[PDB]
Amino acid sequence: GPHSLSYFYTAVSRPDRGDSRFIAVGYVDDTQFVRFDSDAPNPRMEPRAPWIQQEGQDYWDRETRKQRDTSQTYRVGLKNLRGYYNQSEAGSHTYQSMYGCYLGPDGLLLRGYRQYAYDGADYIALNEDLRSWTAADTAAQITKRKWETANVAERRRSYLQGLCVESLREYLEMGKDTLQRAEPPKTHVTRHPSSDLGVTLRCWALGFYPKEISLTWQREGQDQSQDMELVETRPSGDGTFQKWAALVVPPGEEQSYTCHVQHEGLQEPLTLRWD
């Protein structure tokens, strides 16, 4: 589908040490490409994909300055939030934000988003119109009125329609050789003991990019999504992904079953069976 640029902020309070920790990561589609960690000595925005390293020192200086400022805002914010909820000063709490933009087929913002959570629960979110907020509880209504008073939504909207999309387009070109090239899965079928009446057939897809994939088992043309065991798609460690789908079949009936693999890296879907 549509390409995207997304940032993920996690701030955590640490009362024992009297401070907080702020970690940010950025993704284009399913590829992480930057990080910032307030715990790092002299913390900077750092590259985490090869293609972003061609950005010059001005880019890294600017990104570092924004993340340092944002780290401080989320540090004070954690203190405000503890007060809003009258929580004890000894507990650790978590303040998260995520925001990003999807690229439309016309090169415009397809969908922009900005959301926040406190202790893992939705706190406040920018509405689809990029003009108003939805607050989850009494505490978040305090934040909502402050941000309405300061016209915060207009700046989120300008960033999402403007710099987010323009920088996404730039990254997509800089990293075209990996971001815009589908890597098809390497596939194979294994067989394993299961129980009294059945052996397990497991259909593996390794090393694919992007993340989206379809693995299905089909008993004689009709889909077997009954007790197909399907693991969550997991990272390979090299920027690609892995998945498998398994099902228990009658001993001696293995060759009646077919695994169908659809992925945008393949010219046409695959049909695998037990050897």
Binding site: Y59, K66, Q67, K146, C164
Partner: peptide, 9 residues
């Protein structure tokens, strides 16, 4: 590129 700054919660 990240957002330039945001207002306190």
């Amino acid at each position: 590129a990240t957002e330039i700054r945001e207002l306190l919660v």
